[PDB]
Amino acid sequence: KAMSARAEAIKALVVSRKLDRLAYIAHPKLGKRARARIAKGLRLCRPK
RNA sequence: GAGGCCACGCGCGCGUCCCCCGAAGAGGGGGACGGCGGAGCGAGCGCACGGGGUCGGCGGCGACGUCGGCU
Numbered sequence: 001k002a003m004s005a006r007a008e009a010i011k012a013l014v015v016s017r018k019l020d021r022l023a024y025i026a027h028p029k030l031g032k033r034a035r036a037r038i039a040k041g042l043r044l045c046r047p048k
Numbered sequence: 049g050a051g052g053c054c055a056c057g058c059g060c061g062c063g064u065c066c067c068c069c070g071a072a073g074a075g076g077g078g079g080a081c082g083g084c085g086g087a088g089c090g091a092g093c094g095c096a097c098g099g100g101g102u103c104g105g106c107g108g109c110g111a112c113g114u115c116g117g118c119u
Contacts, residue, residue: 015064015065015081015082016081016082016083017083020083021082021083022055022083023083024083025083030083031083033083033084033085034083034084037084040058041057041058041059042057042058042090043058043089043090044058044059045058045059046058046059046060047058047059048058048059048060
């Protein structure tokens with residue numbers, strides 16, 4: 001009974017920062033898409 | 049408005065901030081930043097204070113007198 005009472009009580013629901021940005025890009029997983037963006041920037045050149 | 053530095057450099061759209069007119073301080077027109085968004089790839093020569101020396105540098109001397117042998 002104590003386990004059930006506890007279980008039902010628990011289930012009762014209702015800028016830039018350059019140095020921070022570079023550490024984010026250097027992350028192997030968090031910065032994967034970020035450093036892919038800058039790679040395409042190095043290659044492609046487009047007007048406008 | 050008659051210099052110095054930057055390990056700052058593609059677009060499109062999204063966001064954040066700043067600017068304009070603002071004809072509801074609506075609605076569009078512009079700048080800056082972004083760590084945001086589903087879609088592949090740079091190669092080709094070199095120089096080196098770069099994961100422990102190499103020269104694609106050279107000279108002299110050599111048989112009955114001398115050459116080498118730290119034992």
